[PDB]
């Protein structure tokens, strides 16, 4: 009962999934072959939500892997828990986007999508009652953006009554991978406004910061980042997969943290984050967990949260905790920061508690916030777009796929409007 099939796209998204899946397997106790070796009985009662029980007791991941080139699918098979995945579910093309959303969304992706649109249906049929789809991709390039975007809107025609999650990675100003980020972002966001129910905007610039100072890691890699990001995902859907004193599923969360139709972009956060040095000396108790969580530099979105107010705020705690300890801390925080919470929505807090913790750690906190400080993330992008679009630069790649210069300004306008919605209520 209550199943969620997972979708993946892009070079980064796929990688994230690869780690995320592994982590989830570890949490339940699934091995590379698929046979169960775990001891705790409650891992097997909600195994059905993320694993179909196949023949011979070998569980399989309910997933769809998409790409416009075959390069990334090579390393996913050879790595750990690549053998658990079903051969049928891998989808891939021979062309590739080439860091262009125009090629990705119309010409290249629309030929590949019809295979996936048939594959997902089967998955849907398989489970008793599907409650929502998780989606993992990037907005920086053309492959993860153009394909995923194309897909997500066509799901709303067949399944209008289901919740829609999207785990994205938006561009940073300092750590700029590609040149045409402003373009891709500007166009890819447009469709994610009306079609999605919730979106987690992650940024690598913040991740790096988190890594250098807090974890004290001398040589970070993308692997670390993947591990981090996956943790957040694990956190949000913990209440479904395990019992608890106060359970909070996805729909509930959505209802609580999305007050208005067009303002649903969130910012993830994770705690506790401890190095080898801070593992010994940091006293892991609820208050400690709390304070760390609300720090500006501990966020995964590279902004200044204290420029504006949080519209809503929710948290998902794990491991056994006393509720007077838990529920008081939030209140205290609110009291402290009376200038950093919206006044006309009194009592902004939402809490959730799980009995089964992460293996090794005693407690954990996943922070999902909704703020007016997302303006800083978009504003810069808008500016960049303006700078680019003024001289019609890098345009012949997009215009070659049959896109008018008006069609840029149509999405641009929408983006602007969206941005304004935050500054309406700030």
């Amino acid at each position: 009962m209550r199943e969620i099939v997972h979708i993946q796209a892009g070079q980064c998204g796929n990688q994230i999934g690869a780690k995320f899946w592994e982590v989830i397997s570890d949490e339940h106790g699934i091995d590379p072959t698929g046979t169960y070796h775990g001891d705790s009985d409650l891992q097997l009662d909600r195994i059905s939500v993320y694993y179909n029980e196949a023949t011979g007791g070998k569980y399989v991941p309910r997933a769809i892997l998409v790409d416009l080139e075959p390069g990334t699918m090579d390393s996913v098979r050879s790595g750990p828990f690549g053998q658990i995945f079903r051969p049928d579910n891998f989808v891939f093309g021979q062309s590739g986007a080439g860091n262009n959303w125009a090629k990705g969304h119309y010409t290249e992706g629309a030929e590949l999508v019809d295979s996936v649109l048939d594959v997902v249906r089967k998955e849907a049929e398989s489970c008793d009652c599907l409650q929502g789809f998780q989606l993992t991709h990037s907005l920086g390039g053309g492959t993860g953006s153009g394909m995923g975007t194309l897909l997500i809107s066509k799901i709303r025609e067949e399944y209008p009554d289901r919740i829609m999650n999207t785990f994205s990675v938006v561009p940073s100003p300092k750590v700029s991978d590609t040149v045409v980020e402003p373009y891709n972002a500007t166009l890819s966001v447009h469709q994610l406004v009306e079609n999605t129910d919730e979106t987690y905007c992650i940024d690598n610039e913040a991740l790096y910061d988190i890594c250098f100072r807090t974890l004290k890691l001398t040589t970070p890699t993308y692997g670390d980042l993947n591990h981090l990001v996956s943790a957040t995902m694990s956190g949000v859907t913990t209440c479904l997969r395990f019992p608890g004193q106060l359970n909070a599923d996805l729909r509930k969360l959505a209802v609580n943290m999305v007050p208005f139709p067009r303002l649903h972009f969130f910012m993830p956060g994770f705690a506790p984050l401890t190095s080898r040095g801070s593992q010994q000396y940091r006293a892991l108790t609820v208050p400690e967990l709390t304070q760390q969580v609300f720090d500006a530099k501990n966020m995964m979105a590279a902004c200044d949260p204290r420029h504006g107010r949080y519209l809503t705020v929710a948290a998902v705690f794990r491991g056994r905790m006393s509720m007077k300890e838990v529920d008081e801390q939030m209140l205290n925080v609110q009291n402290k920061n009376s200038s950093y919470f919206v006044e006309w929505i009194p009592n902004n807090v939402k809490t959730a508690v799980c009995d089964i913790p992460p293996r090794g750690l005693k407690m954990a906190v996943t922070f999902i916030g909704n703020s007016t400080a997302i303006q800083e993330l978009f504003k810069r992008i808008s500016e960049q777009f303006t700078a680019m679009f003024r001289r019609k630069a890098f345009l012949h790649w997009y215009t070659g796929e049959g896109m008018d210069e008006m069609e840029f300004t149509e999405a641009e306008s929408n983006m602007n409007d969206l941005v304004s919605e935050y500054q309406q209520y700030q």
């Binding site: 009662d45 056994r320 509720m323 007077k324 006309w344 807090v349």
Partner: protein
């Protein structure tokens, strides 16, 4: 001969209920198996030869909270016909529970209720545990309540509701939920008792000396209170207070039927040795502002009526004295039209204590359910909270999506406002 049907709605109801059941089991000397190695006839029906099944119905829209009971120690006490389970949850929404999802499950349960209700002969009244702030506990309850007036009507109903706190509350959309669900409560429910978690927490901290409480400590506390209502039925004291009698006593008007509870003494195992528990002291404890179950102010309030229920080692000789003393005091005060305002109950049976319990084993115990103007002020701030939320159409679109028309909100707020003045009118 006498009988009563318990109902449990939402997660909260389920959670509360388990503890209560455990307490009941402890009381009558029944292990989880259901075979005892009379008084218990009310809540337990003896099936064939030595199988005690409870008068119970657990409703929930998730499987998680109900399957917690099916896998635990009390697997043997219930069977799948009693335990009803949905698919899609209420999702902390009134509109999801009442209109969309509520049509399918209620039908299943009504038949079940009938099957349980027609089996027993001496129906005293119903008990319905839920929360106002909860999704299932608001949307389904309202529906359920509406349904129950068709089949029965005059047969009595009670509900022990978890009232939301202004400070320590664990959900954002709670204001809305309360306002809507109180529309059905005024027409249908005969008398609803109200408890606030924040109030409980303070009590847990100060008196019990446990600075790390969780829901399991509150549940236990609640269960004792619940027992103290039904203790008059199941045991034969010198003087008795039935449910109908209680209703007659405590509830004066058609609009007002919202008394609040209190329980004393509640103290640690080490504190029991020093503290000489007298009757007068315990009486006082019920009237203290510190020991109240709701965030309220007895200093501003005036008690119209309040029903004391003693269990353990008590006799009427000093009870009278206690009563007199309270009357004499002017810190406690009543409304002009009610000269005599108490209803006094006694019981020989001592209140039991749970294995590994936070509460100490005591001789005496008290439970006062007071109807008052103190709780009238509690909704004035709720309304304010609600109003602000509504003023800019916050969280409204979700509700609209589930088939809630815009006039519903208008209906529920205005009514609430009207109600707030009623108390004032009565107390002038």
């Amino acid at each position: 001969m006498r009988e009563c049907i318990s109902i449990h709605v939402g997660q909260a109801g389920v959670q509360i209920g388990n503890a209560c059941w455990e307490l009941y089991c402890l009381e009558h000397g029944i292990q989880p198996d259901g075979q005892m190695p009379d008084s218990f006839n009310t809540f337990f029906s003896e099936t064939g030869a030595g199988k005690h099944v409870p008068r119970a119905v657990f409703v929930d829209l998730e499987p998680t909270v109900i399957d917690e009971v099916r896998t635990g120690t009390y697997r043997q006490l219930f069977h799948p016909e009693q335990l009803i389970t949905g698919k899609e949850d209420a999702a902390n929404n009134y509109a999801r529970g009442h209109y969309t999802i509520g049509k399918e499950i209620i039908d299943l349960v009504l038949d079940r209720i009938r099957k349980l209700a027609d089996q027993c002969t001496g129906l005293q009244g119903f008990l319905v545990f839920h929360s106002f702030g909860g999704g299932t506990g608001s949307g389904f309850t309202s529906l359920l309540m509406e349904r129950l007036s068709v089949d029965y009507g005059k047969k009595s109903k009670l509900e022990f509701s978890i009232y939301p706190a202004p400070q320590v509350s664990t959900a954002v959309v709670e204001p809305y939920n309360s306002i809507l669900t109180t529309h059905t409560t005024l027409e249908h429910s005969d008398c609803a008792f109200m408890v606030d978690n924040e109030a409980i927490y303070d009590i847990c901290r100060r008196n019990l000396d446990i600075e790390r409480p969780t829901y399991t400590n509150l549940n236990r506390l609640i269960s004792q209170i619940v027992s103290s209502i039904t203790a008059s039925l199941r045991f034969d004291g010198a003087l008795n207070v039935d449910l109908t009698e209680f209703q007659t006593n405590l509830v004066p008007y058609p609009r007002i039927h919202f008394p609040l509870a209190t329980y004393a003494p509640v103290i640690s195992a080490e504190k029991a040795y020093h503290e000489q528990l007298s009757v007068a002291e315990i009486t006082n404890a019920c009237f203290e502002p510190a020991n109240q179950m709701v965030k309220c102010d007895p200093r501003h309030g005036k008690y119209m009526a309040c029903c004391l229920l003693y269990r353990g080692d008590v006799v009427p000789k000093d009870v009278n004295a206690a009563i007199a003393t309270i009357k004499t005091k002017r810190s406690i005060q009543f409304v002009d039209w009610c000269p005599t305002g108490f209803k006094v109950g006694i019981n020989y049976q001592p209140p039991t204590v749970v294995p590994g319990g936070d509460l100490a084993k005591v001789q005496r115990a008290v439970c006062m359910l007071s109807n008052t103007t103190a709780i009238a002020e509690a909704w004035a701030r709720l309304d304010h909270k609600f109003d602000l939320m509504y003023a800019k159409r916050a969280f409204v679109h979700w509700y609209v999506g589930e088939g809630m028309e815009e006039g519903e909100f208008s209906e529920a707020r205005e009514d609430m406002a009207a109600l707030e003045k009623d108390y004032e009118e009565v107390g002038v």
